[PDB]
Design an enzyme around this catalytic site. Structure first.
Site, PDB file in Angstrom:
ATOM      1  N   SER A 600      37.236  37.335  73.595  1.00  0.00           N
ATOM      2  CA  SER A 600      37.634  38.137  74.743  1.00  0.00           C
ATOM      3  C   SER A 600      36.517  38.144  75.779  1.00  0.00           C
ATOM      4  CB  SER A 600      37.973  39.561  74.309  1.00  0.00           C
ATOM      5  OG  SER A 600      39.080  39.569  73.426  1.00  0.00           O
ATOM      6  N   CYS A 768      42.079  47.414  71.713  1.00  0.00           N
ATOM      7  CA  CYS A 768      41.501  46.107  71.444  1.00  0.00           C
ATOM      8  C   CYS A 768      40.522  46.203  70.286  1.00  0.00           C
ATOM      9  CB  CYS A 768      40.799  45.543  72.682  1.00  0.00           C
ATOM     10  SG  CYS A 768      39.851  44.047  72.368  1.00  0.00           S
ATOM     11  N   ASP A 813      45.282  43.903  72.331  1.00  0.00           N
ATOM     12  CA  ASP A 813      44.532  42.657  72.262  1.00  0.00           C
ATOM     13  C   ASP A 813      43.753  42.688  70.945  1.00  0.00           C
ATOM     14  OD1 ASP A 813      43.348  40.227  72.735  1.00  0.00           O
ATOM     15  OD2 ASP A 813      41.914  40.981  74.218  1.00  0.00           O
ATOM     16  N   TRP A 815      42.750  41.128  67.088  1.00  0.00           N
ATOM     17  CA  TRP A 815      42.520  39.865  66.400  1.00  0.00           C
ATOM     18  C   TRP A 815      42.009  40.178  64.998  1.00  0.00           C
ATOM     19  CZ3 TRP A 815      39.300  41.178  70.642  1.00  0.00           C
ATOM     20  CH2 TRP A 815      37.977  41.497  70.308  1.00  0.00           C
TER      21      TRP A 815
HETATM   22  C1  LIG Z   1      42.342  36.556  71.193  1.00  0.00           C
HETATM   23  C2  LIG Z   1      41.171  36.509  70.207  1.00  0.00           C
HETATM   24  C3  LIG Z   1      40.075  37.174  70.757  1.00  0.00           C
HETATM   25  C4  LIG Z   1      38.880  37.261  70.034  1.00  0.00           C
HETATM   26  N1  LIG Z   1      37.705  37.971  70.619  1.00  0.00           N
HETATM   27  C5  LIG Z   1      36.465  38.059  69.865  1.00  0.00           C
HETATM   28  C6  LIG Z   1      35.269  38.779  70.455  1.00  0.00           C
HETATM   29  O1  LIG Z   1      35.344  39.270  71.532  1.00  0.00           O
HETATM   30  N2  LIG Z   1      34.030  38.863  69.688  1.00  0.00           N
HETATM   31  C7  LIG Z   1      33.952  38.239  68.334  1.00  0.00           C
HETATM   32  O2  LIG Z   1      32.955  38.297  67.698  1.00  0.00           O
HETATM   33  N3  LIG Z   1      35.132  37.540  67.778  1.00  0.00           N
HETATM   34  C8  LIG Z   1      36.373  37.457  68.546  1.00  0.00           C
HETATM   35  N4  LIG Z   1      37.515  36.768  67.979  1.00  0.00           N
HETATM   36  C9  LIG Z   1      37.415  36.156  66.647  1.00  0.00           C
HETATM   37  C10 LIG Z   1      36.746  34.778  66.811  1.00  0.00           C
HETATM   38  O3  LIG Z   1      37.646  33.910  67.415  1.00  0.00           O
HETATM   39  C11 LIG Z   1      36.326  34.205  65.452  1.00  0.00           C
HETATM   40  O4  LIG Z   1      37.352  34.395  64.526  1.00  0.00           O
HETATM   41  C12 LIG Z   1      35.043  34.893  64.965  1.00  0.00           C
HETATM   42  O5  LIG Z   1      34.127  34.989  66.011  1.00  0.00           O
HETATM   43  C13 LIG Z   1      34.423  34.068  63.831  1.00  0.00           C
HETATM   44  O6  LIG Z   1      34.214  32.742  64.276  1.00  0.00           O
HETATM   45  P1  LIG Z   1      33.392  31.682  63.294  1.00  0.00           P
HETATM   46  O7  LIG Z   1      33.814  30.269  63.626  1.00  0.00           O
HETATM   47  O8  LIG Z   1      31.907  31.823  63.515  1.00  0.00           O
HETATM   48  O9  LIG Z   1      33.737  31.991  61.703  1.00  0.00           O
HETATM   49  P2  LIG Z   1      34.641  30.977  60.751  1.00  0.00           P
HETATM   50  O10 LIG Z   1      33.884  29.693  60.509  1.00  0.00           O
HETATM   51  O11 LIG Z   1      35.957  30.663  61.432  1.00  0.00           O
HETATM   52  O12 LIG Z   1      34.936  31.737  59.303  1.00  0.00           O
HETATM   53  C14 LIG Z   1      35.667  32.944  59.328  1.00  0.00           C
HETATM   54  C15 LIG Z   1      36.117  33.307  57.884  1.00  0.00           C
HETATM   55  O13 LIG Z   1      35.091  33.661  57.163  1.00  0.00           O
HETATM   56  C16 LIG Z   1      35.646  34.730  56.079  1.00  0.00           C
HETATM   57  N5  LIG Z   1      34.717  35.826  55.930  1.00  0.00           N
HETATM   58  C17 LIG Z   1      34.095  36.479  56.916  1.00  0.00           C
HETATM   59  N6  LIG Z   1      33.325  37.424  56.360  1.00  0.00           N
HETATM   60  C18 LIG Z   1      33.474  37.352  55.029  1.00  0.00           C
HETATM   61  C19 LIG Z   1      32.925  38.077  53.991  1.00  0.00           C
HETATM   62  N7  LIG Z   1      32.001  39.175  53.780  1.00  0.00           N
HETATM   63  N8  LIG Z   1      33.248  37.796  52.737  1.00  0.00           N
HETATM   64  C20 LIG Z   1      34.120  36.796  52.470  1.00  0.00           C
HETATM   65  N9  LIG Z   1      34.662  36.084  53.485  1.00  0.00           N
HETATM   66  C21 LIG Z   1      34.334  36.366  54.763  1.00  0.00           C
HETATM   67  C22 LIG Z   1      36.800  35.175  56.505  1.00  0.00           C
HETATM   68  O14 LIG Z   1      37.889  34.719  55.586  1.00  0.00           O
HETATM   69  C23 LIG Z   1      37.006  34.561  57.904  1.00  0.00           C
HETATM   70  O15 LIG Z   1      38.305  34.215  58.083  1.00  0.00           O
HETATM   71  C24 LIG Z   1      38.789  36.678  68.755  1.00  0.00           C
HETATM   72  C25 LIG Z   1      39.888  36.012  68.209  1.00  0.00           C
HETATM   73  C26 LIG Z   1      41.079  35.928  68.932  1.00  0.00           C
HETATM   74  C27 LIG Z   1      42.308  35.211  68.374  1.00  0.00           C
END
Ligand SMILES: Cc1cc2nc3c(=O)[nH]c(=O)nc-3n(C[C@H](O)[C@H](O)[C@H](O)COP(=O)(O)OP(=O)(O)OC[C@H]3O[C@@H](n4cnc5c(N)ncnc54)[C@H](O)[C@@H]3O)c2cc1C
Ligand code: HEM
Ligand SMILES: Cc1cc2nc3c(=O)[nH]c(=O)nc-3n(C[C@H](O)[C@H](O)[C@H](O)COP(=O)(O)O)c2cc1C
EC number: 1.6.2.4
Length: 816
Positions: A600, A768, A813, A815
């Site tokens: 966001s 949100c 909003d 997620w």
């Molecule tokens: C419309 C929308 C808006 C968003 N806005 C924001 C924002 O403003 N700020 C923000 O930070 N993110 C936001 N997100 C989420 C963001 O897109 C990512 O999902 C998030 O930042 C993680 O990205 P990553 O690639 O680093 O982690 P990834 O590599 O994708 O891994 C995530 C996975 O790790 C697992 N996991 C996480 N923690 C643990 C735990 N303790 N134990 C076991 N498993 C775990 C979970 O299963 C999770 O699904 C938004 C998502 C959407 C769809």
């Protein structure tokens, strides 16, 4: 009613029924539309929308229409020109007809736009809202009725690429219409004009109508088949899935066909066990109030009052549905449970495709996990099946090899507009500082410089980012696999009739594909395990990889406990199973694609036009496998330092929007990172106060743990509050005393003022964040506030809040 949206809906209540019951529209719904009549209606629509958008541009700044000026999202003249070029050849300009009813519609449009612009809304509504409702289905019908290419050619009028969510956008449009200040007599004229527009469309449709005037089991036995895939379809989606599922039967050692259960009588299925290990799969779409497709009716009724024994039959069901229906996938679930109760045994869990989310990707996932389950339930063919052919280019110039870009070759270097999901812009990391004040988790505020990218955005819109996996992981995978990562190669699809000719941009090295194209961090899927099973030397590990490729027995349990719960990436599996020595090309073939991650936007473009702010929490945890897992996008962005570190990003429009009138009060709720978009809102609001515009109240409801731990933007929010821009700053601290305090409690505290704002000031509610079930908690809090302070029963209060949602005043909003 009082609000313009509800009043127009109530006025057009009858003419809408009359319009969709017109002979041409009813024939369209049943799929009985001709190419000639379709060309006719499309040319008429070209003329009508040309006139309408002409008058819209003529009145795009008149206050009686200005809140409704959405050219980038709604306008259709360009798409209609594309469709005219398609349907009427290269010289469509002189070939398209101009019927008298079309001329009458155009004349009324010009009269309105020239001497009565206050009525223009009534027309725009009548068209644009209509295009965002039924128009999504009509296309799916035309694609099958006229048989058009899947690229959408000829149906560009039915495609809104800038509207990610049509329902939320219709909410926003209703809000913008309700912004229109008008006298009650003007409101009555507007409703009458909406009736007039509906009548014009009705008589247009009328004029355009005036210008028109064997046993399948014994057949599998007599043809040598053992897989049959029945489909229950109405608009062809289930047909597509069933045919694609039947095609891959020949590509696993077996052979299959599709089937329409409208021409067979499925009682024949009683004699199915007489085939050397056969399977029957159903792709069942559900319509109506949980009723089957028409072609499956003879099937459904036969399932009702019968109990013919079918013991030994192995089956598998996949249901096509939509979550927004309160009869979700009734047909698939019914077929599944009835086939189980009748004596057949299931091989794979029933799939529940969601049309609200993504049906195509859901079906792909279901099939991907489905094939290995059948494989290991029926035995094995030594896993002797491939999909891409490896071609090694040992001598090749570097200007021909993909180095990490996503679109065209060298698109990351010759960055030329426009920029979107297929050609992301490489924004420069301006700032990357820590918002978190404690040490529990890392929360960061990034700034992306998109100066000369010509990229536009508004507060609430999203920014997506293409990250890269940690290079140490790639080097470790390359070492343990005993393969050279700098080998320039390509994987070519040998299935010619598929536009998808590569699993990822090729030619490229294994290192580049492992870094930018393949997800190497999420838990591996069942298919990749079943395909790596043929590379495990030790039987104690090959049998483990085999069992973890089925839905029944201890296999699914072990898969969920050891790979899903423990969250082991591919490197962790290669470490814990030292027998796995697969080739890297097959691994690249099997691994899913590295997806982009959305955030966001945490800035208003009215104060930061050349920069986009992101507020993100870094994902980093200790998995149950002992190893520490790092989030791809969050760690990737954390590594970005202003010492030029680029970020491939693009902007996706969202329906989260500030109110058009500056005097309208806002109530924003966002615990934790869900404060991100509101950080933009407040800014814009502050900016509107600096321009001298009268700005209403602005209430923020933020939530964190401790004031000294993860209080995001404490100094900026304090400055906003003391400058008068932020009217109230209510923060809930969940770990600052005995009982935890959340934002719902702060809302319940200010129930009286919140109700006065909602009822007297026409406020806009925003929610949100990724907080757990926070949506329903705030929703019930507002339910109770409306029920109490507005003398209402609970039911009418919940209807009041849902009406606010419809009017575009309660926005989400969320997620995960
Ligand atoms: C419309 C929308 C808006 C968003 N806005 C924001 C924002 O403003 N700020 C923000 O930070 N993110 C936001 N997100 C989420 C963001 O897109 C990512 O999902 C998030 O930042 C993680 O990205 P990553 O690639 O680093 O982690 P990834 O590599 O994708 O891994 C995530 C996975 O790790 C697992 N996991 C996480 N923690 C643990 C735990 N303790 N134990 C076991 N498993 C775990 C979970 O299963 C999770 O699904 C938004 C998502 C959407 C769809
Ligand atoms: C194929 C025939 C049609 C079907 C199946 C159909 C279906 C629908 C549906 C399901 C909705 C509700 C969407 C929602 O509010 O969430 C709707 C609303 C609407 N339809 Fe139709 N429609 C048809 C024809 C038309 C035509 C010809 C027009 C005008 C050109 C039109 C204009 C509208 C408008 C403006 C709305 C929004 C009403 C509101 O919420 O205020 N429809 N239609
Ligand atoms: C009139 C209509 C009614 C629907 N009813 C349901 C429903 O009750 N439950 C559901 O899950 N999906 C429902 N859907 C969603 C469809 O099942 C979904 O679009 C499916 O993919 C259509 O499959 P098909 O195109 O192959 O016919 C409905 C769709 C339409 C057009």
């Amino acid at each position: 009613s009082q609000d313009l949206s509800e009043a127009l809906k109530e006025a057009t209540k009858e003419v809408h029924i009359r319009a969709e019951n017109s002979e041409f529209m009813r024939n369209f719904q049943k799929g009985q539309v001709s190419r000639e009549g379709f060309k006719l209606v499309m040319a008429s629509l070209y003329h009508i929308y040309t006139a309408l958008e002409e008058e819209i541009e003529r009145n795009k700044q008149n206050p009686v229409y200005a809140p409704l000026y959405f050219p980038e999202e709604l306008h259709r003249r360009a798409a209609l020109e594309q469709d005219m070029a398609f349907w009427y050849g290269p010289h469509w300009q002189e070939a398209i007809p101009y019927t008298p009813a079309t001329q009458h519609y155009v004349k009324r449009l010009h009269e309105v736009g020239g001497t009565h612009p206050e009525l223009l809304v009534a027309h725009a509504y009548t068209r644009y809202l209509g295009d965002l409702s039924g128009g999504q289905v009509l296309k799916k019908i035309a694609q099958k009725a006229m048989a058009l290419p899947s690229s959408g050619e000829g149906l560009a009028f039915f495609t809104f690429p800038s509207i990610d969510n049509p329902t939320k956008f219709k909410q926003l449009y209703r809000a913008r219409m309700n912004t229109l200040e008008m006298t009650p007599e003007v409101k009555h004229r507007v409703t009458e004009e909406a009736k007039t527009a509906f009548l014009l469309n009705i008589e247009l449709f009328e004029e355009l109508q005036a210008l028109l005037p064997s046993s399948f089991v014994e057949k599998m036995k007599k043809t040598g088949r053992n897989i049959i895939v029945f489909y229950g379809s109405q608009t062809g989606t289930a047909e597509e899935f069933a045919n694609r599922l039947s095609k891959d039967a020949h590509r696993y050692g077996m052979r299959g066909m599709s089937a329409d259960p409208e021409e067979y009588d499925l009682a024949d299925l009683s004699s199915l066990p007489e085939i050397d290990k056969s399977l029957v799969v159903f792709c069942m779409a559900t319509y109506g109030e949980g009723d089957p497709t028409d072609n499956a009716q003879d099937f459904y009724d036969w399932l009702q009052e019968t109990d013919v024994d079918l013991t030994g039959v192995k089956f598998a069901v996949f249901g096509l549905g939509n979550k927004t229906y309160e009869h979700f996938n009734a047909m698939g679930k019914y077929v599944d449970q009835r086939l189980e109760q009748l004596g057949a045994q299931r091989i794979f869990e029933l799939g529940l495709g969601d049309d609200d989310g993504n049906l195509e990707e859901d079906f792909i996932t279901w099939r991907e996990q489905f094939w290995p389950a059948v494989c290991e339930f029926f035995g094995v063919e030594a896993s002797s099946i491939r999909q891409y052919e490896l071609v090694v280019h040992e001598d090749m110039d570097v200007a021909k090899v993909y180095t990490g870009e996503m679109g065209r070759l060298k698109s990351y270097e010759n960055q030329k507009p426009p920029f979107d999901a297929k050609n992301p812009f490489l924004a420069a990391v301006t700032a990357n500082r820590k918002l978190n004040q404690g040490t529990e988790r890392h929360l960061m505020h990034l700034e992306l410089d998109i100066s000369d990218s010509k990229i536009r955005y508004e507060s609430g819109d999203h920014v997506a980012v293409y990250p890269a996996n940690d290079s140490a992981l790639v080097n470790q995978i390359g070492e343990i696999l005993g393969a050279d990562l700098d080998v320039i190669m390509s994987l070519n699809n040998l299935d010619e009739e598929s536009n998808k000719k590569h699993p990822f941009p090729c030619p490229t090295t294994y290192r580049t594909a492992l870094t930018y194209y393949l997800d190497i961090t999420n838990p591996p899927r069942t298919n990749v395990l079943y395909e790596l099973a043929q590379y495990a030397s030790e039987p104690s590990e090959q049998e483990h990889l085999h069992k973890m490729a089925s839905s029944s027995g201890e296999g699914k349990e072990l898969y969920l406990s050891w790979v899903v719960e423990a969250r082991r990436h591919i490197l962790a599996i290669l470490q814990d199973y030292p027998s796995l020595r697969p080739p890297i090309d097959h691994l690249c073939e099997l691994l899913p694609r590295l997806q982009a991650r959305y955030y966001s936007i945490a800035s208003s473009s009215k104060v930061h036009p050349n920069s986009v702010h992101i507020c993100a929490v870094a994902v980093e945890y200790e998995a149950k496998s002992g190893r520490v897992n790092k989030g791809v996008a969050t760690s990737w962005l954390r590594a970005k330092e202003p010492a030029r570190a680029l970020v491939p990003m693009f902007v996706r429009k969202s329906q989260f929007r500030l109110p058009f009138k500056s005097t309208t009060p806002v109530i924003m709720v966002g615990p934790g990172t869900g404060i991100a978009p509101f950080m933009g809102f407040i800014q814009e609001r502050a900016w509107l106060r600096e321009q001298g515009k009268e700005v209403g109240e602005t209430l923020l409801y933020y939530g964190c743990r401790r004031s000294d731990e993860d209080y995001l933007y404490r100094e900026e929010l304090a400055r906003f509050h003391k400058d008068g821009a932020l009217t109230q700053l209510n923060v809930a601290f969940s770990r600052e005393q005995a009982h935890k305090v959340y934002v719902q409690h702060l809302l319940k505290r200010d129930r009286e003022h919140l109700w006065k704002l909602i009822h007297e000031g026409g406020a806009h509610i925003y929610v949100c964040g990724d907080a757990r079930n926070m949506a329903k908690d705030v929703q019930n809090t507002f339910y109770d506030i409306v029920a109490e302070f507005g003398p209402m029963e609970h039911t009418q209060a919940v209807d009041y809040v849902k009406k606010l949602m419809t009017k575009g005043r309660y926005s989400l909003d969320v997620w995960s």
